[PDB]
Design an enzyme around this catalytic site. Structure first.
Site, PDB file in Angstrom:
ATOM      1  N   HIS A 102       0.873  -1.226  -0.003  1.00  0.00           N
ATOM      2  CA  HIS A 102       0.054  -0.060   0.086  1.00  0.00           C
ATOM      3  C   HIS A 102       0.885   1.226  -0.139  1.00  0.00           C
ATOM      4  CE1 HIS A 102      -4.281  -1.374   0.464  1.00  0.00           C
ATOM      5  NE2 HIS A 102      -3.693  -2.136   1.231  1.00  0.00           N
ATOM      6  N   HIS A 327      -9.415   9.807   0.158  1.00  0.00           N
ATOM      7  CA  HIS A 327      -8.550   8.582   0.057  1.00  0.00           C
ATOM      8  C   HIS A 327      -7.280   8.768   0.954  1.00  0.00           C
ATOM      9  CE1 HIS A 327      -5.723   5.619  -2.095  1.00  0.00           C
ATOM     10  NE2 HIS A 327      -6.712   5.000  -2.186  1.00  0.00           N
TER      11      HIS A 327
HETATM   12  O1  LIG Z   1      -5.125   2.603  -2.748  1.00  0.00           O
HETATM   13  C1  LIG Z   1      -4.683   1.610  -2.153  1.00  0.00           C
HETATM   14  O2  LIG Z   1      -3.623   1.566  -1.785  1.00  0.00           O
HETATM   15  C2  LIG Z   1      -6.027   0.487  -1.610  1.00  0.00           C
HETATM   16  C3  LIG Z   1      -5.752  -0.734  -2.247  1.00  0.00           C
HETATM   17  C4  LIG Z   1      -6.434  -1.862  -2.012  1.00  0.00           C
HETATM   18  C5  LIG Z   1      -7.441  -1.617  -1.128  1.00  0.00           C
HETATM   19  C6  LIG Z   1      -7.607  -0.394  -0.386  1.00  0.00           C
HETATM   20  O3  LIG Z   1      -8.840  -0.271   0.281  1.00  0.00           O
HETATM   21  C7  LIG Z   1      -7.006   0.524  -0.809  1.00  0.00           C
HETATM   22  C8  LIG Z   1      -7.160   1.975   0.041  1.00  0.00           C
HETATM   23  O4  LIG Z   1      -8.087   2.135   0.673  1.00  0.00           O
HETATM   24  O5  LIG Z   1      -6.209   2.931  -0.035  1.00  0.00           O
END
Ligand SMILES: O=C(O)c1cccc(O)c1C(=O)O
EC number: 3.1.4.-
Length: 438
Positions: A102, A327
């Site tokens: 992530h 985000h």
């Molecule tokens: O953007 C991301 O790195 C991501 C990837 C997969 C599931 C997620 O929930 C996220 C996030 O919420 O940031």
């Protein structure tokens, strides 16, 4: 301002709400430095889009993509990158099941020095278009003269800590970047690095990562105040993991316990969790498609309805961003009247055991599934006892911290529900005229 904390530009808000915001084209601009080579740590990549964000003159400089993709996803990413002979790839090992890479970070090597950018956006158009996202911009770090012997270390230990984070990958392409960092002077850094890496950490390593890393920093570098039990904890995120059958399983037993630490001495502390409601998503600039980036699944949520009584709406009038779905992920410790904060963290880490770690083996081992990265702002690192909260994010003494959403957070109304991405919403259409049928 000493904090160098920015939001991404949002298309569709008035200019007053983007003055001081940064688009990726701004970060990669020649005005920031003469690019020699870069590393892009992220989760999702649109490589065609990404190369276009570099200035034309810099688009053939080497780029390393650090990702966690496997099998067909890995093939898809390589196929994306194949047309660009200057792009190399590093597959971060994910040896624990259900882990994710992530971490969102740019390492930017210039003629003039080195810059580190720790942020929250995927490298795709939609993540920089109409979302609320966070950026920390390091200073321009000068190179240490050849033959000169100095640490280049900051009072927050950022240089060693960043190298430690990179060493956990065990990757030849990142040993190259470690050697770059060794050669630069990072002593001006005033933030603490908080990373997660996959593993099972005991003994001398338990404090290195995740929520035990946060706890260690708060114990060592923050002071408790009288009436500390009245200072709330605020967590703000874009996804939630499976937390257990009740709050005592993880949320309030070890996660909250780490976050309420202050100082070195030996709970009714209020815990506010901020997560978009269905109505927040529906009326957002993106509409329901914003919910594709808020991946809370019904399977997870129906196991933990107890959690939703903690949930507060997304509201960001202070930054004109109430309709720009978050985000960014942030955690902080406000005073009881929300006028000060004892610390602020911006990170990739969502509200999940995978990201923050969960204690195993009779409390002796911290198990983490994923790679995460954030930076912690502590008043002591700025010569202060606390931060005053900036009242308007984009307004004008520079020792006030720019919290990007509204305080106090507003509890969900009785008719609100948390956004859950894999059920339909057909009751009322979004800002583009559409329903949500997954
Ligand atoms: O953007 C991301 O790195 C991501 C990837 C997969 C599931 C997620 O929930 C996220 C996030 O919420 O940031």
């Amino acid at each position: 301002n000493p904090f160098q904390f920015y939001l991404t530009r949002v298309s569709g808000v008035k200019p007053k709400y983007n003055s001081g915001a940064l688009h990726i084209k701004d970060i990669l601009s020649p005005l920031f430095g003469t690019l020699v080579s870069s590393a892009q740590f992220n989760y999702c990549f649109d490589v065609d889009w990404l190369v276009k964000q570099y200035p034309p003159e810099f688009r053939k400089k080497p780029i390393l993509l650090v990702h966690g993709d496997k099998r067909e996803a890995k093939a898809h990413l390589h196929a994306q990158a194949k047309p660009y002979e200057n792009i190399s790839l590093c597959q971060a090992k994910l040896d624990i099941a259900f882990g994710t890479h992530h971490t969102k970070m740019m390492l930017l090597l210039y003629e003039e020095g080195l810059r580190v950018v720790i942020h929250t956006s995927n490298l795709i158009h939609a993540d920089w278009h109409q979302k609320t996202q966070g950026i920390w911009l390091s200073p321009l770090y000068p190179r240490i003269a050849d033959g000169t012997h100095k640490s280049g270390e900051s009072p927050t230990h950022f240089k060693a800590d960043l190298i430690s984070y990179l060493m956990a990958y065990n990757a030849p392409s990142l040993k190259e970047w470690i050697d770059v960092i060794h050669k630069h002077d990072l002593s001006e850094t005033n933030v603490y690095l908080i990373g997660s890496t996959p593993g099972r950490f005991q003994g001398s390593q338990k404090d290195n990562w995740g929520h035990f890393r946060l706890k260690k920093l708060l114990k060592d570098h923050a002071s408790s105040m009288p009436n500390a039990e009245s200072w709330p904890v605020v967590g703000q995120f874009s996804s939630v993991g499976s937390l257990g059958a009740d709050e005592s399983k993880w949320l309030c037993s070890e996660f909250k316990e780490s976050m309420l630490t202050l100082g070195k001495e030996s709970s009714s502390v209020p815990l506010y969790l901020i997560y978009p409601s269905v109505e927040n998503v529906r009326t957002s600039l993106e509409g329901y498609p914003a919910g594709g980036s808020l991946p809370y699944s019904i399977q997870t949520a129906e196991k933990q309805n107890w959690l939703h009584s903690y949930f507060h709406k997304w509201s960001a009038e202070t930054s004109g961003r109430s309709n720009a779905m978050p985000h960014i992920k942030t955690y902080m410790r406000p005073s009881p009247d929300f006028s000060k904060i004892a610390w602020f963290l911006v990170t990739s880490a969502n509200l999940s055991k995978a990201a923050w770690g969960a204690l195993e083996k009779n409390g002796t081992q911290l198990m983490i599934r994923s790679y995460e990265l954030g930076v912690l702002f502590l008043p002591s690192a700025f010569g202060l006892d606390s931060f005053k909260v900036k009242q308007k994010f984009f307004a004008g003494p520079m020792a006030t911290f720019p919290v990007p959403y509204d305080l106090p957070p507003e509890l969900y109304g009785s008719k609100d529900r948390p956004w859950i991405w894999n059920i339909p919403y057909v009751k009322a259409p979004d800002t583009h005229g559409n329903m949500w049928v997954p």
